[PDB]
Amino acid sequence: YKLICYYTSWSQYREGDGSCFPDAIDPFLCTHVIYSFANISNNEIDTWEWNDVTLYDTLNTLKNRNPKLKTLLSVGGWNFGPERFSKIASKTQSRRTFIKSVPPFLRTHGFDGLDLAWLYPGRRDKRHLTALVKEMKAEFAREAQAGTERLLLSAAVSAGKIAIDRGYDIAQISRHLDFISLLTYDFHGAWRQTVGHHSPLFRGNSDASSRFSNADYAVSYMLRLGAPANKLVMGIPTFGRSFTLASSKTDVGAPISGPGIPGRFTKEKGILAYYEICDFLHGATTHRFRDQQVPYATKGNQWVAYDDQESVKNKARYLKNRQLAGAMVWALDLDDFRGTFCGQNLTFPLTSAVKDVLARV
Ligand SMILES: *[C@@H]1O[C@H](CO)[C@@H](O[C@@H]2O[C@H](CO)[C@@H](O[C@H]3O[C@H](CO[C@H]4O[C@H](CO)[C@@H](O)[C@H](O)[C@@H]4O)[C@@H](O)[C@H](O[C@@H]4O[C@H](CO)[C@@H](O)[C@H](O)[C@@H]4O)[C@@H]3O)[C@H](O)[C@H]2NC(C)=O)[C@H](O)[C@H]1NC(C)=O
C-alpha cells in the first residue's frame, strides 16, 4: 500500500512550535513525500521559496535513512493561477518547453518524480491536460533510456463529479499516470452560508441533494469512468474547516455568518491544523455524524468540521475494502508533527493511524 504525504513550503514561516521543516519528517512514515509547490517561470519549472534549494536537499537527505522512500515535487497549487496552467498547456510550443525543463531539474535536486496540481482545468482544458500528461510521460520514458530509474508522474485530481466531467479525461490520463490522488476533502462548498462537513465518507441517509459530495461516490465514480483501483489514492485531510455561527443553532443546516476565526499558528480564516484543533477541543462539545462517519465540534460561536484518529482509520479501511492503491495525506505539517499538542505523546497521530490500518491486512 502507498502512503502519499504532502509537505508544504510555507509551513516553515509559522511561529513557534508551528514552524515545520522537512527535518521533522519521520523517514519511515510515508512511502512518498511530495513537496509543494514548484512554480513556472518562462515556461520552465522553477523554485518558489527563496530557500527551496536548501529545503529540497533537506527533504531528500531523509532518503539516506530510508532507502525506499520516494520524493516528488508538485507543480501548481491554489496560489498558482489555473489560467497560467491553461495558457502553458494550450500552446504546443510552451508545453514542450515546460516538459523538457522538468527531468533535468528533478534530477539536479534529487526528486524521483513530478506531481501535477492543476486546480482546476475547465471545460476548455480537458483536451490540453491529456496532451500534457501524455507528452510528460513520453519525455520521462525517453529520459529513462539514459540508464536511470524512470521518473514518476502523478496528479492531484478534483473529487467533485461536475469538476471531473468538466475538465478531465479520466480514462485517458489514468493510463499514463503512476497514481492519482483524489481530493476527497473539498466537498462542502465554500460558496454558501450553512454548516457542513467537507470530508464526508458516506452520502448521508438524511439529505437528498448532493449525494455526489462524499468520498464514497467520488471513488465509485472514478472506478466507473475507468480509473484502475491500483492507481487511485484517497485523500485524507489532516486539517479542519471552521465557521462562525450566525445563531445559537449547532446542528446540521445551521446558519453561517462566515469562516471561523484563525488559529494561533495557522493564521488563516476557515481552516485549523489538527494540532490547533486538539487545543480547541478543550471545553468544546464533540459530535459525530453517524451516516457520514465524521466528527465536528462547537465552542461559543465557532463550529469546526474535522477528522480524528477514528474517522481517519475508518476511511483507511474503506480504501482497503475497495482495493485502492493507498492513501494520500494533506498535509504532514498540519498534523501534530511535534506530537505535543494532542494528548498522547505520539508524533503524527493522524498519519500514523492511517498507516496502522494499511499495515494490517
Ligand atoms: C512564478 O513564476 C512566475 C513566472 O515567471 C513569476 O511571475 C511573474 O514574475 C514577473 C517578475 O517578477 C512579474 O512580471 C513583471 O514583469 C515586468 C518587470 O519584470 C521585468 O522588468 C524589466 C523588463 O520589463 C526587467 O528589467 C526586469 O529584470 C524584469 O525581467 C513588469 O513590466 C511587469 O509589469 C506590469 O505588471 C502589470 C501587473 O500589475 C501588468 O499589467 C503589465 O503587463 C506589466 O507586466 C510585471 O510586473 C509578474 O508579476 C509575474 N507574473 C506575471 C508575468 O503575471 C512569479 O513571480 C513566480 N512566483 C514566485 C513566488 O516567485
Curated annotation (Swiss-Prot):
UniProt keywords, alphabetically: Antimicrobial, Apoptosis, Cytoplasm, Disulfide bond, Endoplasmic reticulum, Glycoprotein, Inflammatory response, Lectin, Secreted, Signal
Organism: Capra hircus
Cysteines joined through disulfide linkages: C5-C30, C278-C342
Sites where the protein binds chitin: E49, W50, G76, G77, W78, N79, Y120, L183, T184, Y185, D186, R241, W330
Protein's UniProt name: Chitinase-3-like protein 1
Subunit structure: Monomer.
Localization per record: Secreted, Extracellular space; Cytoplasm; Cytoplasm, Perinuclear region; Endoplasmic reticulum
Gene Ontology terms: cellular component: cytoplasm; endoplasmic reticulum; extracellular space; perinuclear region of cytoplasm
